[PDB]
Amino acid sequence: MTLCLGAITTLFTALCAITQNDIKKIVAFSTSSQLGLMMVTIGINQPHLAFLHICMHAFFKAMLFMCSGSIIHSLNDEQDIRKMGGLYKAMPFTTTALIIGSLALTGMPYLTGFYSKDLIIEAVNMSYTNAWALLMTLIATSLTAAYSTRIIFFAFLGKPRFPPLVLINENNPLLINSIKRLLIGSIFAGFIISNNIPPMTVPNTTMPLYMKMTALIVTIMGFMLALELNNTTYYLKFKYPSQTYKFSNMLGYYPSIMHRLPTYHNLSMSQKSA
Amino acid sequence: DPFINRFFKYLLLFLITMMILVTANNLFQLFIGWEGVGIMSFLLIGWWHGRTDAN
Amino acid sequence: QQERDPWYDWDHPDLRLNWGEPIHWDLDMYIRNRVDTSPTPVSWNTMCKHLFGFVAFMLFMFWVGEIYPSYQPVGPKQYPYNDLYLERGGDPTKEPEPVVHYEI
Amino acid sequence: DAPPLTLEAIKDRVLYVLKLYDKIDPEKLSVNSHFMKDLGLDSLDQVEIIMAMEDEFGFEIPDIDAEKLMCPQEIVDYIADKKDVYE
Amino acid sequence: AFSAPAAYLTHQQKVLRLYKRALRHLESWCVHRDKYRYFACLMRARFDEHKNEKDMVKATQLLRQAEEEFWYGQHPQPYIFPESPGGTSYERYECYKVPEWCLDDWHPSEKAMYPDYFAKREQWKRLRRESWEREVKQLQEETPPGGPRTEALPPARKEGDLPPLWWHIVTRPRERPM
Amino acid sequence: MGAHLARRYLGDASKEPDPLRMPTFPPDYGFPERKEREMVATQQEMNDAQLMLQQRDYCAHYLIQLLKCKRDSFPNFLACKHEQHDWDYCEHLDYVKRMKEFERERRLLQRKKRREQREAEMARG
Amino acid sequence: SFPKYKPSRLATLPATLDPAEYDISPETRKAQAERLAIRSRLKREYLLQYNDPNRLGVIEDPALIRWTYARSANIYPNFRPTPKTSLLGALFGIGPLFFWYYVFKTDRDKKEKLIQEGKLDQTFNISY
Amino acid sequence: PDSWDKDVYPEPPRRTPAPAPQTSLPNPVTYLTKIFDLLVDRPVTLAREFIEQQHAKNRYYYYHREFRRVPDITECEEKDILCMFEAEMQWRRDYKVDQEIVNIIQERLKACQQREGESYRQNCAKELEQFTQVSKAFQDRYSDLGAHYSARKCLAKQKQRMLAERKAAKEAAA
Amino acid sequence: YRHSIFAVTHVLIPVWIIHYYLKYHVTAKPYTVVERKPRIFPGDTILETGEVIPLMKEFPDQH
Amino acid sequence: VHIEPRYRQFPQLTRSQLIQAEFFSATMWFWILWRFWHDSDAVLGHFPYPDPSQWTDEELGILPDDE
Amino acid sequence: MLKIIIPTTMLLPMTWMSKHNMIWINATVHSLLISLISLSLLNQLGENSLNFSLTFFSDSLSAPLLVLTTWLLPLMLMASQSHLSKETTTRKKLYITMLILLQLFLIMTFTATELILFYILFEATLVPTLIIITRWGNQTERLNAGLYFLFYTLAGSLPLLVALVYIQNTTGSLNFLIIHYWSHPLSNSWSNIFMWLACIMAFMVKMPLYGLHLWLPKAHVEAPIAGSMVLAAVLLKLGGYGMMRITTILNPLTNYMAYPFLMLSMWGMIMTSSICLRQTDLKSLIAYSSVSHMALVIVAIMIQTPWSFMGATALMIAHGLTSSMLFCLANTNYERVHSRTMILARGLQTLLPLMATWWLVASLTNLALPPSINLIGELFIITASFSWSNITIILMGMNMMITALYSLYMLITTQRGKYTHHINNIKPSFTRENALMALHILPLLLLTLNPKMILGPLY
Numbered sequence A: 001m002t003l004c005l006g007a008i009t010t011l012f013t014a015l016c017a018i019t020q021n022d023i024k025k026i027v028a029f030s031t032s033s034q035l036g037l038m039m040v041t042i043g044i045n046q047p048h049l050a051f052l053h054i055c056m057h058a059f060f061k062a063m064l065f066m067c068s069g070s071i072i073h074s075l076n077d078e079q080d081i082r083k084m085g086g087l088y089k090a091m092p093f094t095t096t097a098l099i100i101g102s103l104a105l106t107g108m109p110y111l112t113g114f115y116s117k118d119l120i121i122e123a124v125n126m127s128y129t130n131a132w133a134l135l136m137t138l139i140a141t142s143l144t145a146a147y148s149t150r151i152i153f154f155a156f157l158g159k160p161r162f163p164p165l166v167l168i169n170e171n172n173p174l175l176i177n178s179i180k181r182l183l184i185g186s187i188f189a190g191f192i193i194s195n196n197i198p199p200m201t202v203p204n205t206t207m208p209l210y211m212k213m214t215a216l217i218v219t220i221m222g223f224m225l226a227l228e229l230n231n232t233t234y235y236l237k238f239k240y241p242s243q244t245y246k247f248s249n250m251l252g253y254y255p256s257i258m259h260r261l262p263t264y265h266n267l268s269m270s271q272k273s274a
Numbered sequence B: 001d002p003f004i005n006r007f008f009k010y011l012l013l014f015l016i017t018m019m020i021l022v023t024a025n026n027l028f029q030l031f032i033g034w035e036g037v038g039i040m041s042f043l044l045i046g047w048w049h050g051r052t053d054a055n
Numbered sequence C: 001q002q003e004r005d006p007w008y009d010w011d012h013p014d015l016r017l018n019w020g021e022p023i024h025w026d027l028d029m030y031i032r033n034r035v036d037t038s039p040t041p042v043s044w045n046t047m048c049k050h051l052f053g054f055v056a057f058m059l060f061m062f063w064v065g066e067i068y069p070s071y072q073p074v075g076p077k078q079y080p081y082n083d084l085y086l087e088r089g090g091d092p093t094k095e096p097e098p099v100v101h102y103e104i
Numbered sequence D: 001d002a003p004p005l006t007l008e009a010i011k012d013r014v015l016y017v018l019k020l021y022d023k024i025d026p027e028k029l030s031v032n033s034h035f036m037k038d039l040g041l042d043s044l045d046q047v048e049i050i051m052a053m054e055d056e057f058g059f060e061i062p063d064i065d066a067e068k069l070m071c072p073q074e075i076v077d078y079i080a081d082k083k084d085v086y087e
Numbered sequence E: 001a002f003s004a005p006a007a008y009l010t011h012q013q014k015v016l017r018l019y020k021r022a023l024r025h026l027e028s029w030c031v032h033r034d035k036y037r038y039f040a041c042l043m044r045a046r047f048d049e050h051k052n053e054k055d056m057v058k059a060t061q062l063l064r065q066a067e068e069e070f071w072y073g074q075h076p077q078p079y080i081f082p083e084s085p086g087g088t089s090y091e092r093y094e095c096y097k098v099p100e101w102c103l104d105d106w107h108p109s110e111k112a113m114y115p116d117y118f119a120k121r122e123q124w125k126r127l128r129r130e131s132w133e134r135e136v137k138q139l140q141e142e143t144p145p146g147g148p149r150t151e152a153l154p155p156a157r158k159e160g161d162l163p164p165l166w167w168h169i170v171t172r173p174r175e176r177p178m
Numbered sequence F: 001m002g003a004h005l006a007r008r009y010l011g012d013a014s015k016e017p018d019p020l021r022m023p024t025f026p027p028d029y030g031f032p033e034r035k036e037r038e039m040v041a042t043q044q045e046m047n048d049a050q051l052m053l054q055q056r057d058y059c060a061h062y063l064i065q066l067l068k069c070k071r072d073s074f075p076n077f078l079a080c081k082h083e084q085h086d087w088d089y090c091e092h093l094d095y096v097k098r099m100k101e102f103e104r105e106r107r108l109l110q111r112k113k114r115r116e117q118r119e120a121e122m123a124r125g
Numbered sequence G: 001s002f003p004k005y006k007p008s009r010l011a012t013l014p015a016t017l018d019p020a021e022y023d024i025s026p027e028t029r030k031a032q033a034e035r036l037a038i039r040s041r042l043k044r045e046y047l048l049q050y051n052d053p054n055r056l057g058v059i060e061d062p063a064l065i066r067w068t069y070a071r072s073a074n075i076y077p078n079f080r081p082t083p084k085t086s087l088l089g090a091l092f093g094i095g096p097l098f099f100w101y102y103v104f105k106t107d108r109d110k111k112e113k114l115i116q117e118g119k120l121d122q123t124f125n126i127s128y
Numbered sequence H: 001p002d003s004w005d006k007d008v009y010p011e012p013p014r015r016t017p018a019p020a021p022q023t024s025l026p027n028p029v030t031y032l033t034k035i036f037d038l039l040v041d042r043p044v045t046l047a048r049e050f051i052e053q054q055h056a057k058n059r060y061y062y063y064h065r066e067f068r069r070v071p072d073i074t075e076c077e078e079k080d081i082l083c084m085f086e087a088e089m090q091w092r093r094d095y096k097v098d099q100e101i102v103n104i105i106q107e108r109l110k111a112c113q114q115r116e117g118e119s120y121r122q123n124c125a126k127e128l129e130q131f132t133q134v135s136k137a138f139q140d141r142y143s144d145l146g147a148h149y150s151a152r153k154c155l156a157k158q159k160q161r162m163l164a165e166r167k168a169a170k171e172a173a174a
Numbered sequence I: 001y002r003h004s005i006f007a008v009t010h011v012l013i014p015v016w017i018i019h020y021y022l023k024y025h026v027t028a029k030p031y032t033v034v035e036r037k038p039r040i041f042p043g044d045t046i047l048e049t050g051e052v053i054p055l056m057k058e059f060p061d062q063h
Numbered sequence J: 001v002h003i004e005p006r007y008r009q010f011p012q013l014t015r016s017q018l019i020q021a022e023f024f025s026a027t028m029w030f031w032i033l034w035r036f037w038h039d040s041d042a043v044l045g046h047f048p049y050p051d052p053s054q055w056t057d058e059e060l061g062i063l064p065d066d067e
Numbered sequence K: 001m002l003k004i005i006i007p008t009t010m011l012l013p014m015t016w017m018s019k020h021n022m023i024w025i026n027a028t029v030h031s032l033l034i035s036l037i038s039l040s041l042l043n044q045l046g047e048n049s050l051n052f053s054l055t056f057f058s059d060s061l062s063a064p065l066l067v068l069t070t071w072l073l074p075l076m077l078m079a080s081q082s083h084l085s086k087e088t089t090t091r092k093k094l095y096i097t098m099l100i101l102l103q104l105f106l107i108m109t110f111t112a113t114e115l116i117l118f119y120i121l122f123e124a125t126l127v128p129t130l131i132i133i134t135r136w137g138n139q140t141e142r143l144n145a146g147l148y149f150l151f152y153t154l155a156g157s158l159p160l161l162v163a164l165v166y167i168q169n170t171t172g173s174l175n176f177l178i179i180h181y182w183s184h185p186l187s188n189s190w191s192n193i194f195m196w197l198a199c200i201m202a203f204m205v206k207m208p209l210y211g212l213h214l215w216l217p218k219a220h221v222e223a224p225i226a227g228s229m230v231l232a233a234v235l236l237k238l239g240g241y242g243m244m245r246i247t248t249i250l251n252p253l254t255n256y257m258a259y260p261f262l263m264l265s266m267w268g269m270i271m272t273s274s275i276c277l278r279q280t281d282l283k284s285l286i287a288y289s290s291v292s293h294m295a296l297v298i299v300a301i302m303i304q305t306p307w308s309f310m311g312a313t314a315l316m317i318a319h320g321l322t323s324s325m326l327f328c329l330a331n332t333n334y335e336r337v338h339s340r341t342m343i344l345a346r347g348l349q350t351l352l353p354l355m356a357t358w359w360l361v362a363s364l365t366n367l368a369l370p371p372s373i374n375l376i377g378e379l380f381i382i383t384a385s386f387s388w389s390n391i392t393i394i395l396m397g398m399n400m401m402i403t404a405l406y407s408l409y410m411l412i413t414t415q416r417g418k419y420t421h422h423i424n425n426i427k428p429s430f431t432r433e434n435a436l437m438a439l440h441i442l443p444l445l446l447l448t449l450n451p452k453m454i455l456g457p458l459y
């Protein structure tokens, strides 16, 4: 039950994330997807990998949220990627910090997220797991790459869309030093923690080559597909949204129905009947 | 922020409650940390008390 | 009150009410902190159908995956001393059924 | 945080936007020229001007108030009054 | 928010509000500036095409069709300015707005901490108290016997008078009080 | 993932092994003389080392050696490469032994199917 | 053409999609003017009392008083025992009680049967 | 330590391995332990030595109260209020003592589990059996007496248990 | 100077109090502070009794 | 450092933040390349995966079908 | 117990002979002194109760309630001196006399060693309460509220008097020690069923049980601040104390007659929490919260296990303190705006900061936030009910969720949001009000520090 709950959670939250326009919302759904992945890790009887991923995710997700907050403060409380743009050169340090955090989140082959996410994916593939849970975990990894691509593409690449009065200034020592401290951890802390902890489980030494590359292959595939779809936005071609897009953008309609129907019935029963 | 001191106090209180939750050895203390981080989340989400969406 | 006009200069801006105008019987239920009835981009029936279909499909596919799991072409793992009889809490006085693992 | 706005800055920015508009000749544009009577625009052009000012200053002018902003000076006064600019 | 609403929206007002809302949602769909400019020019071309219509019934029918098309084609998550009602920064500073009637309850020591401000505050209070009778008399002189048919308020018709019902409009809390 | 899942599900589960029931044949069926696996580390040694019960497999001695090497060379956390490789190699050998068991079960099952089919044909004739 | 929007109870019909907004009778304009006049009179009264310099207190709201009175004190005098009221009261005030009584009685009967049969795991169950 | 009885609170002899370093790098843990001893342990030790020296000047004693046995509810006659009160008080004190016995055994079990750590399932079988026996006896004695428990109710429960045992034994011997 | 005044109070005084509390009050009742027993490997020296835990048997070395 | 706001122009940057961003990006890429050079088996694997179809019936203990 | 009873009977002449401007000072100072003296009863024994004489005795259940009463008297004095400034000196002295008489009757009730004397005193508590309500209430509904309260309680209690005299005739004594040491099983018969019904129904009406509670909203909403404080803090605990004392002789019939009361209590706890969710009056919201908490106490007493009694006692004490604090806060806001509507006054967080802090702490204690004694008692009751059956966890969880929902709803509605524009008579919070809130809240946290003092004899 834990494995299935984690799988559905990570898939659903990533799918909702890949089409949000609020950067804080995207980072929140990424956090939810990582929590679902951790719950999947617990469900396959790998409790220590879950804790390792807790630590690594704490590092790079905290840095990502700090970079998002720096962007928001620079652009005068603007939390819309549709209004961000040009920040790759407008803000160098937050740009490189966010790129490093996104690479660590998606499982860059030797960053902090590699020493937890890669082992989690290998354990999922190599265990006696639910087939649907495994498939949803792989799709969630691809969608993680997808929404990281969306964040970078709509926040730093392209031409500016913010109001003309440029108040961009990221030269504060407090911000720079805090991001620096959380940035060295996002690169080196995974290696140190992995090499210092005692072996808490038997490693998966023998496995097929394609199954070893499963995390990297799906990450690259998600990167490429999301990049192509985002590049299609430049075309002078306008098309109405699809049913799948409406479902994904509106959070699967779960907040609407589940926040309007049960609450209405309970409150109506509270006064009309009781 | 006019109440940045209170904001830092709330952050420290959340840190204390999280440490209690993590280091708790028995279920009652774990529940103490549980509810402490829950109530600190409630207090910090609705930081701007004039915002209906925050409430 | 969420449906009510946000830009109007209400006497109670947060509640979106004017002084003296009749109050709805369910105002305590229709405040902006409570149940919302504003129109949605998608029909309520369509939203309900899509949400129920998605969750039912996920449950059905989880059951199907449970009855058709995924594993690896390996046999059971082997442990030395009668599948770790004493280490897992076996009775020292009672003799366990011997378990022998051979080479291959 | 951000530098405070001034009446002169608001006027300069609104005149900047209006002079970058291509249906208004900058030479015959003054702070008291009316969009309809002496500039020759129409309702849709006024709506576009209001949207441009909203983009320029980063805040939304409600439709009930936007219909009455028929002059650059009126726009300046409205924006300054909403933003609490007095100097 | 500063203008008293009328009893109804005219056809021109309806179509102008639809035009602005459609442009905003199109800009939400067309993130990039050149694409937005292209499609906004096309939208204005459509509005110009239907601009001249002698049959008001046909104009209302076209407006209804356009409203249905907009509702189908609206962006589910449109762009909203941070200070706008749907924005992320809406009503964040409502807890920092404190009124001058709260101000006048201060202790004498607190008042003495700011000597010059309270002198001007007392001047403002004297101005308010010396004008209320004139304001109420002006209000009751101009209103029809039946009663006010709109929320509009008159200006000061005299040189020594202030516009009636001005105190809270003038003394409303600043947009960023603290 | 793998071709074995496809063969068992979209095919002959009778000819494919059951992971939960494996092995279904005597260990010496086909092996005239078969040697029991040798365990190096003793129960007392594993208990003193406090290896996790998941880690107390036939590759436990290499794990104990790796832990001892890691504890002694504490500040230099890169000095246990040889011990780590030895433990991983032993785990790899254990895994390939398990794979051999799976393959043996599969081919024994299909051999039994062929034998029973031939016997049925002989009875029919 | 485009798919229609079906309004619901918890997702109402938007104003721009209301057919009544495109069929405006001259009577409708008069009704709108009357509503605006009522709102303007109420607003004028409130603004006068609110801008009075000599007022120190709360402006009483008769609408609020009527709402709080109808929600609390005016319910019973207007209650008549009808078949609908009787059935709803009986259901909502009796059915849950007997349902929970049945559930707990069955649970406790099973527990007592297990205790008497002596095949219930009661070890370590010291606290009660 | 002599504060508590080592037999009442058992503890296996500790076996700390001797350090056998294999690198020329310094030991940061050793350096930090030395600093901790030089900065914290010595000052707190001096303070405690002064405090204990102050304590030894005004030494005084406190005692453990002793209760003699009194006739119990079985010996008490029917509706003899004085004997009934004495027996009820004695039964309540014995109930508290038994609760503390169960607490002692539980503490021993918890400590042994934590001490054994990763191999607690096998090495703590001795303490789990003692707790099982103690909990079984305690539950049989004071399982379902109720909120208004009394020596009479416990005696009635014991009589019922004895009657059931006698019936079972008679049926077995029949 | 400010760092030194902060460090002595906020770190030094509480650690003094906590160490005094643990060493003389908490570690005066049984089982209050329980350390997990240290891991013992073959070929080791038990310090309390000067014991020599022996090595493991020869490994069937592979390559 | 005081940074003057710009109107419709690229903001003023600082050599310090420029070189810091470049240094940390170069640090990340150097770490990635250096790790992939030394322990490449963490990505490509270290032990070959056996092909069970190439195992003989002799070593798998499968008797001839006729026997 | 005379060292506590006599000082109150001396407080009466002090009140009636003090000067006109010193009555509140004298009463408050000497009430605090009497509370300090009554703190000595907390030193309880581990085997038997404290039997002072043939008439009065103290127990681990009676001591915390007595201390709560003695501590609650000065708080009532402070609130009354707040809202009774314009009354004449004679009427102020009469009000103080009513409060003193109520405290004296409560002390003698909790210390009475015989059931008939306990009945006489716990019935005598009605007269001062009825006088206070129907005389110093503000609204027109105080008369109807007093009638409802009086007649509900008396219709409950008269069969209890008949049952007590019948028990005395049958057994020879109503002394609690005698009826505990000489208790005999209650056979399953109609006569025993109706005796059980008489006793339990009297105390359930006093609790109040769901379906017998209307008098509680009526009285609590329409009573003055002191009356509301004493009605919820102590007068509601008379039913629980009586049920704990009377159930000694009702076994084993309680194992079978408790089903309707348990079902009523659980479902009515859910229903009253839901009612709190949709209340337009703040005092009504607090009253229904009290109803839910006392329904939980009823569940604990009816299931009747040593773990339930401890939780019941802790919940009684914690609910008394929390309800008194909430009523005081509501009364302060009422004195500001002269209306009890919850949505009339908003933005009080930005109008009165420290009062908002007091509101937050009171709301946090109202819901079971650990390690508060509210949570201790609620958790003990929930665990005992789980041992009783495994769907009680479902009911308790639903109740806890709705409790948190309505507590935070009250907090957000009263404090958060934007202030009402036209309400400009909200003066800064008084030192007296802040001291009242502090004296309400600090003992709660100290009892959290030391929890065994309010866990009853079963500890």
Ligand SMILES: CCCCCCCCCCCCCCCCCC(=O)OC[C@H](COP(=O)([O-])OCC(O)COP(=O)([O-])OC[C@@H](COC(=O)CCCCCCCCCCCCCCCCC)OC(=O)CCCCCCCCCCCCCCCCC)OC(=O)CCCCCCCCCCCCCCCCC
Pocket: A015, A018, A019, A135, A138, A139, A142, A143, A146, A150, A218, A221, A222, A225, A226, A229, A230, A233, A239, A240, A241, A242, A243, A244, A245, A248, A249, C053, C054, C057
């Ligand atoms: C009851 C059903 C229950 C289902 C349960 C299971 C669900 C699983 C879902 C998995 C994810 C599906 C894809 C994303 C859906 C949301 C798309 C969206 O909103 O896009 C807008 C959003 C951008 O929106 P925007 O920028 O705001 O602008 C608005 C758009 O312009 C607005 O433009 P638009 O509206 O035209 O764009 C949307 C449109 C176009 O967008 C896409 O197609 C996006 C996805 C493209 C990639 C996925 C397909 C190919 C994937 C594999 C490719 C390689 C295969 C291997 C090949 C080698 C083999 C050796 O999408 C579609 O037409 C549907 C495609 C997805 C179908 C999902 C399954 C069926 C759903 C229900 C049936 C109805 C479907 C039809 C639609 C409704 C009726 C009209 O897109 C993105 O951000 C990128 C999305 C894709 C990136 C990730 C791609 C890889 C990850 C997914 C595939 C798995 C790869 C790894 C597999 C590993 C296996 C071991």
Ligand SMILES: *P(=O)(O)OCC(C)(C)[C@H](O)C(=O)NCCC(=O)NCCSC(=O)CCCCCCCCCCCCC
Pocket: D042, D043, D044, E011, E012, E013, E015, E016, E022, E025, E026, E029, E046, E047, E050, E051, E052, E053, E059, E060, E062, E063, E066, E067, E069, E070, E073, E074, E075
């Ligand atoms: P100024 O006062 O000159 O304004 C001129 C007006 C418009 C007032 C005219 O005087 C007038 O009233 N003309 C006749 C009425 C009329 O023009 N009716 C038709 C106008 S509505 C119309 O034609 C809209 C059609 C196209 C736009 C539809 C919007 C749907 C697309 C939105 C999609 C959502 C996301 C992009």
